[PDB]
Symmetry: C3
Amino acid sequence: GIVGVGIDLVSIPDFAEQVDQPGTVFAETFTPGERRDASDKSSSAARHLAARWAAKEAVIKAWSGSRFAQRPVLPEDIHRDIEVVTDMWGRPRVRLTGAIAEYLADVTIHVSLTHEGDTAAAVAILEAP
Amino acid sequence: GIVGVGIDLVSIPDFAEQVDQPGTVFAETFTPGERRDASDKSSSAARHLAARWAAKEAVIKAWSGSRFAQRPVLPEDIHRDIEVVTDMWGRPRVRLTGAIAEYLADVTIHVSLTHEGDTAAAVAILEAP
Amino acid sequence: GIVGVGIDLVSIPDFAEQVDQPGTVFAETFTPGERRDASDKSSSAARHLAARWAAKEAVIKAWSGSRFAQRPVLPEDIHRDIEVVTDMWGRPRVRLTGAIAEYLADVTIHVSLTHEGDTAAAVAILEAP
């Protein structure tokens, strides 16, 4: 039934301060214009994009923390294999591609994001048929 | 099998400064008693009600992020068809009435809430039977 | 099926004030060296140990908030019967001993942990065989 769970918290200021820096895992998962507008800790860009990163991380912990997570997990093409997106109705959906996709081969991920003030959070649950 | 998951954080300080503001969605869920007590930035009733609030928020996100989001849109019929209570013993429970109780006819709602510092939080999970 | 869920936030500042203090239920569950290092609010220890404590609370509430508790009454030696071990490359897992282990006899528990800035958090999820 439940393969996994994850929870992550993220400081929006601290994230805003480090999201835009040529050579990070941010570069490999956010758009330059997304990293750039998010550089601004007072913009909604930043507040929203912190939440999306918190979902990504929550998903990582949920899998990592499972069995479906191999004993040498996590090479480092695992941040854009997991993609956290808004769906047509305004709701979060995870999109797996790549090698993680193949692990999590046949599992449903539910996710929820939230943000308040300078803090942003997410949790993700992994199910199994 | 998990049909919905929600999480939401609320700012106990901001919450308490708007819980007694007239016209709001709060007056349909808390008693004028409560709303006024929950007006002091650190008064135990603030923290507690911030949390019931977060609880509610998080059940709403779990539903509007599921398949039975089948519109009867966001009428804030939902805001008053859904209620979070602190049972006799003090355990948090969900009460559904009206429309939502019909849509979530046979689903199971699990919540938990907490509050630390200036911040309250909660999480709900929706199960298909 | 899901039997219960649990979530908990902890102020690491406040925890590292009240953790090396005498007669606290901390003493009954953490090691005198453990609590002594978690006094430095800015240390690794205090972080690391706040997330373990939120873990315990998140599992305590998951079980508590259920009908798999029997009109809950906390058994004694809880907190310390609920262990938050890790699995080498740093993977959380819960360990039960004693009464709870019996009460939660054939339950599987999922936890995740997390700590950002000065708050730490955890979530738990209790499922039937």
